[PDB]
Write a protein that binds this DNA or RNA. Structure first.
Length: 682
RNA sequence: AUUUUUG
């Protein structure tokens, strides 16, 4: 079964996620909405949690700011989105297609809401105060304008088809009648800062009640009759739990609300640092609340929570899903207030994937949001067991490499040229090399030390073209540019080539360097004596990989796959040149194998540890291709990404499973057997 | 208030 590590739920949106009974959850993320099946219908083992990422609403060209399902029986498949691209779209989630849309707003849309009473009414609000009422299924629209203020949220009454509550940036809360040109029926005064959330009481009559949540740290309950406040709940200041959190990153309160139709005398809200509270409205003056996951530790959110969406499953479980700045989507069991499960998300390109050969299945992911992920992919009760590492990172993690033998030892490299060393078994900050790369760290590799270094050294390749040799025990010490050793050993006069890739042979006897001009150079230990130059690519080399040493034939370990900014992949066999061990280098100009098919640059190639000469490649053409390299046969093509692939890694235990990562902020785990397409698009 | 003209 495939898996998806999706883009992070968007931040600072009053309503950018929702859920329908059954059930289905949708959350805005970047330019799309992701769909997640929850409950019995997810078809999961009694061990693992019952959810699956099943869909994507694709079409917006800019940030999705709002999302809302229809909650009319028989039309749960319909939903609406707003976007910074200026449009409001109506979607059918069954087909994942646009039913109809409008571009009536001329200013940045703030939010929108599907009317609970009128089947085809979608009400949206923008930054200038303009409200549009949209009856999509009769082609109708009405503009309303109340106050010249920035709308933060709005919520149609669940009881009265004409009444809509609007909350503004300055704290104004109004209840308007859209049949009366938007006339203000109630002007609710009391809040001193942004309204983040408006929830109507699910029960009519006291009239009706409604609750507003504000950045001013108050939740206010109002009487819809007497147009005045009848209850003020102030958030409790609580001791920070769980997350050892980066203090510097700025973050103020987001106070969102959930008023359960299940239990009208309870009210759920967010709190400082992403805690969730269940308020007891009967004990108003005592300000009684119960903390979510107050018993368990490390289960609560670590940063502010933006959206809360109730979901009753068909086996009558009362769930509540929470989105958060901490990039976890959490599912809460209302009956127990415990976190049933957590779905991690990515806030940047997935630049890098590396499987530990020490802890099988431990998959490190280098992400553009400055956090290293470690996914225990073989966790039994959890398909998304992921730990985050943020200390000493900050920038985009563009390169990763596990140590060959030492548990928890993970090298990483960043977009600002930094090279660091993590002990993921600890929570101590990483050691950072004192020597920086001028540009992005594109590759990291462990290998035998070479002079003047004084059992394995760390090699790093940066975008400026230098390969550094670091002493993992002396990271604060100096790192050596191996170009000096190359130069001396090979007596070179002219300027050395710009190195763009480094890859050590599995035995650690041979080092291959890819260069910017397309050439690949083959050096042998201990002095990096050049024994061979390969001239095949004529653009920058992005990736090089040596076949493993446990195939049916030992000779296979001399197979070397390579990808560059051209779409064609080559395989070279260095048995002859390496065994002959020449005193002057050989120039190779003919490929041992030639793999054609992709239509864009190659970012990563990897050999299956389960087969002989089986290669997977990742390309900017948006696909990962699995080849029988020996036969030059294109076996299967994965097209699940919507962006350009940046990395790929074979599962260590499952010959059918591969992981890939792209600039769509997604990591996919997919099955070669579920892939019917044989080759890239042509 | 993160969401990359960027291997």
């Amino acid at each position: 079964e495939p898996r998806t590590l999706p883009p992070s739920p968007n931040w600072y949106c009053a309503r950018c996620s929702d859920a329908v009974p059954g059930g289905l959850f949708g959350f805005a993320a970047r330019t799309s909405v992701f769909l997640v099946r929850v409950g019995p219908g997810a078809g999961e083992s009694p061990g693992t949690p019952p959810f699956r990422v099943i869909g994507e609403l694709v079409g917006h060209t800019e940030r999705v700011s709002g999302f809302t399902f229809s909650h009319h029986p028989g039309q749960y498949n319909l939903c609406a989105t707003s976007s910074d691209d200026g449009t409001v779209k109506i979607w059918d989630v069954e087909t994942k297609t646009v039913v109809t849309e409008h571009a009536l707003h001329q200013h940045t849309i703030s939010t929108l809401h599907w009317s609970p009473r009128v089947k085809d009414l979608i009400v949206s609000g923008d930054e200038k105060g303009v409200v549009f009422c949209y009856w999509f299924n009769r082609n109708d629209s009405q503009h309303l304008f109340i106050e010249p203020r920035t709308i933060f949220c709005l919520t149609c009454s669940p009881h009265h088809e004409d009444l809509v509550a609007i909350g503004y940036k300055d704290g104004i809360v109004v209840i308007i009648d859209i049949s009366k040109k938007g006339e203000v029926i109630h002007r609710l005064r009391g809040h001193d800062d942004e309204i983040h959330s408006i929830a109507w009481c699910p029960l009519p009559g006291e009239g009706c009640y409604l609750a507003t949540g504000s950045k001013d740290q108050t939740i206010r309950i109002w009487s819809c009759s007497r147009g005045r406040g009848v209850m003020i709940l102030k958030l409790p200041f609580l001791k920070r739990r769980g997350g050892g959190i980066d203090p510097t990153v700025k973050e103020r309160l987001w106070l969102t609300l959930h008023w359960p139709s299940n239990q009208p005398t309870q009210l759920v809200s967010s709190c400082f640092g992403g805690e969730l509270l269940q308020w007891d409205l009967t004990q108003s003056w005592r300000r009684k609340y119960t903390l979510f996951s107050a018993s368990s530790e490390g289960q609560n959110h670590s940063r502010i929570v933006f959206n809360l969406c109730p979901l009753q499953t068909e086996d009558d479980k009362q769930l509540l899903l929470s989105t958060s700045m901490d990039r976890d989507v959490k599912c809460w069991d209302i009956a127990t207030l415990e976190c049933s499960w957590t779905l991690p998300s990515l806030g940047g390109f997935a630049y890098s994937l590396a499987f530990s050969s020490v802890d099988i299945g431990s998959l490190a992911i280098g992400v553009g949001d400055g956090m290293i992920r470690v996914w225990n992919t073989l966790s039994i009760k959890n398909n998304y067991d992921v730990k985050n590492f943020w200390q000493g990172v900050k920038s985009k993690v563009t390169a990763l490499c596990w140590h060959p033998t030492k548990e928890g030892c993970l090298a990483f490299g960043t977009d600002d040229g930094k090279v660091g060393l993590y002990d993921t078994y600890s929570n101590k900050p990483p050691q950072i090399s004192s020597t920086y790369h001028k540009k992005t760290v594109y590759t990291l590799a462990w290998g035998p030390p070479v002079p003047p270094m004084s059992s394995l050294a760390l090699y790093s390749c940066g975008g400026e073209g230098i390969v550094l040799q670091h002493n993992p025990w002396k990271l604060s010490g100096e790192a050596f540019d191996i170009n000096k050793l190359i130069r001396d050993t090979n007596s070179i006069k002219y300027k050395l080539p710009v190195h763009t890739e480094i890859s050590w042979k599995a035995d650690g006897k041979i080092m291959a360097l890819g260069n910017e001009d397309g050439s690949i150079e083959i050096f042998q230990i201990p002095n990096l004596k050049l024994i061979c130059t390969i001239q095949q690519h004529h653009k920058l080399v992005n990736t090089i990989s040596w076949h493993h040493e446990h195939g049916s034939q030992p000779e296979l370990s001399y197979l070397m796959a390579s990808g560059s900014n051209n779409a064609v992949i080559y395989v070279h066999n260095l048995k002859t040149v390496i065994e002959s061990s020449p005193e002057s280098p050989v120039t190779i100009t003919e490929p041992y194998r030639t793999l054609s098919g992709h239509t864009a640059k190659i970012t990563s190639v990897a050999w299956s540890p389960h087969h002989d000469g089986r290669l997977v490649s990742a390309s900017y053409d948006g696909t990962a291709q699995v080849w029988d390299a020996l036969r030059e046969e294109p076996l299967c093509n994965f097209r699940g990404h919507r962006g350009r692939l940046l990395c790929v890694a074979w599962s260590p235990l499952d010959p059918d499973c591969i992981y890939s990562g792209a600039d769509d902020f997604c990591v996919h785990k997919w099955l070669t057997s579920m892939q019917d397409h044989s080759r890239p698009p042509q």
